[PDB]
Amino acid sequence: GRYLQGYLLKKRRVDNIFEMLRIDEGLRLKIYKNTEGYYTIGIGHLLTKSPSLNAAKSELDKAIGRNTNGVITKDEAEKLFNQDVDAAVRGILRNAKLKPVYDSLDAVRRAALINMVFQMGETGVAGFTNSLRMLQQKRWDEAAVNLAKSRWYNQTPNRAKRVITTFRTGTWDAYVDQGFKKRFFTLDFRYGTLSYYLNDHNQTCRGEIVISLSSVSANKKDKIIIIDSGMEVWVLKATTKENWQSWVDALQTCFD
Secondary structure: OOEEEEEEEEEOOOOOHHHHHHHHOOOEEEEEEOOOOOEEEEOOEEOOOOOOHHHHHHHHHHHOOOOOOOEOOHHHHHHHHHHHHHHHHHHHHOOOOOHHHHHHOOHHHHHHHHHHHHHHOHHHHOOOHHHHHHHHOOOHHHHHHHHOOOHHHHHOHHHHHHHHHHHHHOOOHHHOOOOOEEEEEEEEOOOOEEEEEOOOOOOOOOEEEEHHHOEEEEEOOOOEEEEEOOOOEEEEEOOOHHHHHHHHHHHHHHHO
């Protein structure tokens, strides 16, 4: 018995605007027609409006320094994301209604505002005048109840509640239970390397951490196990207490 193996849920810690919008908006790698039928990609990145897939592929090809072919990488989507964030921030700072509030907010709540911009557009966010005033005055709890008095809150409830919670607390707590995906893990007892795969079968190794060089933190109540390699952090979640204990004991062997 050289390998401890089995399924576990995995996610990346949501503690920055990219991971947040990745959860809330979504990150697509293949060119997809957005809601208005215009070729889009990554995290709400508008390519153009021409019904020519070749045009979009080229505007996308001019976007990234290569011939994507209607498909991009996650690292690429991020690059388009960072550009869109800068455009969003500048738009906000040039909008007389949003600048004041944005100047008064902290980094985390600022990401929450941008999140709203991505979803409903700058002018749409400027329509929450009463909530904006409250956030500017730092009346967190009151801003939260008002932000909820809107179509947004009723149409996209879950996303809305997460953004509002972020405005209320100034923390990333609304996203702790978000971003989990089922993956198959393999721990090699002989050399101490932990690898994961898309599933039971597939051969392609999607990631790997040398346990003996990482920090392993675990929480039984949440059935969470956090593995920090220094340059990468995996947040894993077991399906039961037995399953959870089996992995924690196995990873603990790398330190006795």
